[PDB]
Amino acid sequence: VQLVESGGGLVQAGGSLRLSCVVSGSAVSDYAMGWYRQAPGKQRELVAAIYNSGRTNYVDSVKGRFTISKDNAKKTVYLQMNCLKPEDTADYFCNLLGATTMSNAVWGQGTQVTVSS
Ligand SMILES: [Hg+2]
């Protein structure tokens, strides 16, 4: 898969961002997708998942604050990020679910989110 993230930036605590992930091919239509984040001294962790049916789930720390969605026609996955806190500072990536362990996974450059206090 080919993946290009955008929308990150510097934001103030309490603010909002909308991240986009444009995917080549039909991955958005064919596979469950997720948004991941990698904090300074950590590994990539799944924070939001969207399943083929349109069902979603979230890690507890972002539930109610972040919303994952997709547009099949635009081959894009979105992460609406509200109620941002400094602890959300991280590099954000989108990918097929399982990409942290599955063979031949490919990652984009990610998009950096920095939340100031
Ligand atoms: Hg909130």
Numbering used by the authors: 3 to 119
How does the study describe this entry?
For the derivatized protein we obtained crystals at two very different pH values of 3.5 (Nb36-C85-1) and 7.5 (Nb36-C85-2). To investigate the potential of the Hg-derivatized Nbs for rapid and automated structure determination without prior phase information, we analysed two SAD data sets exhibiting space groups P212121 (Nb36-C85-1) and P21 (Nb36-C85-2). For the P212121 case, 720° of data were collected to a maximum resolution of 1.5 Å. Analysis of the anomalous signal from the four consecutive 180° wedges indicated a significantly stronger signal in the first 180° of data compared with the subsequent 540° of data. Hence, in line with previous studies of Hg-substituted cysteine side chains, we observed a significant selective decay of the anomalous signal from Hg, whereas the overall data quality was preserved during the full rotation range. The SAD-based density-modified map based on the 1–180° data was used for automated model building and refinement with the Buccaneer pipeline, which traced the four molecules in the asymmetric unit almost completely. As already indicated by the site identification in phenix.autosolve, the structure did not contain a single Hg atom at each free Cys85 introduced into the Nb. Instead, two Hg atoms each bridge two cysteine side chains from two NCS-related Nbs and no density could be assigned to the benzoate moiety. This implies that the benzoate was released at some point between the isolation of monomeric Hg-substituted Nb and cooling of the crystal.
Nbs are derived from natural llama heavy-chain antibodies that are devoid of a light chain and in which the heavy-chain variable domain (VHH) exclusively mediates the interaction with the antigen. The VHH domain is structurally similar to the IgG VH domain, with three complementary-determining regions (CDRs) that are responsible for antigen binding. We describe the introduction of cysteine residues at conserved framework serine positions in a Nb specific for human complement component C5 and subsequent site-specific labelling with Hg derivatives and structure determination by SAD and SIRAS. Hg incorporation did not perturb the structure of the Nb or its antigen-binding capacity.
